[PDB]
Write a protein that binds this DNA or RNA. Structure first.
Ligand SMILES: [Mg+2]
Ligand SMILES: [Mg+2]
Ligand SMILES: [Mg+2]
Length: 64
RNA sequence: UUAAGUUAUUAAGGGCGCACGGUGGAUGCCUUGGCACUAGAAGCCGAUGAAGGACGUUACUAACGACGAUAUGCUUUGGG
């Protein structure tokens, strides 16, 4: 997904980070209430956030 | 029939031999780990926060390895 992230503006990366952290929060609450059963979504969102923060840092290090 | 004399049978248990079991982990075979060296290289890191740790990170969860809230991992360049 790193290629897809790389085409987003910096603010959009920040917007996707927040919404991904919101989806991840919702998945954990579903899991704790025994309602998710689709447990592979948790790791997918987690690594997506990692990729989003990786690129944000990359560009914040190319600018400075 | 009696008298005199002689000598068995028993095995509660024991002994010896034999047969069949149990226990135990010697012995043989084996190696995942060691021991002693040879050759080439390297030896010491730290306020740009070390050595060593604590606590955490996996869908489930104790310990160990790995990793650090980007956590049982992220990007990239090559290999495969
Ligand atoms: Mg008897
Ligand atoms: Mg015996
Ligand atoms: Mg594990």
């Amino acid at each position: 997904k790193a290629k897809e992230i790389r085409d987003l503006t910096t603010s959009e990366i920040e917007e996707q980070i927040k919404s991904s952290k919101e989806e991840l929060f919702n998945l954990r609450f579903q899991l704790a209430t025994g309602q998710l059963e689709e447990t592979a979504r948790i790791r997918t969102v987690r690594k997506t956030i990692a990729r989003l923060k990786t690129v944000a840092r990359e560009r914040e290090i190319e600018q400075s």
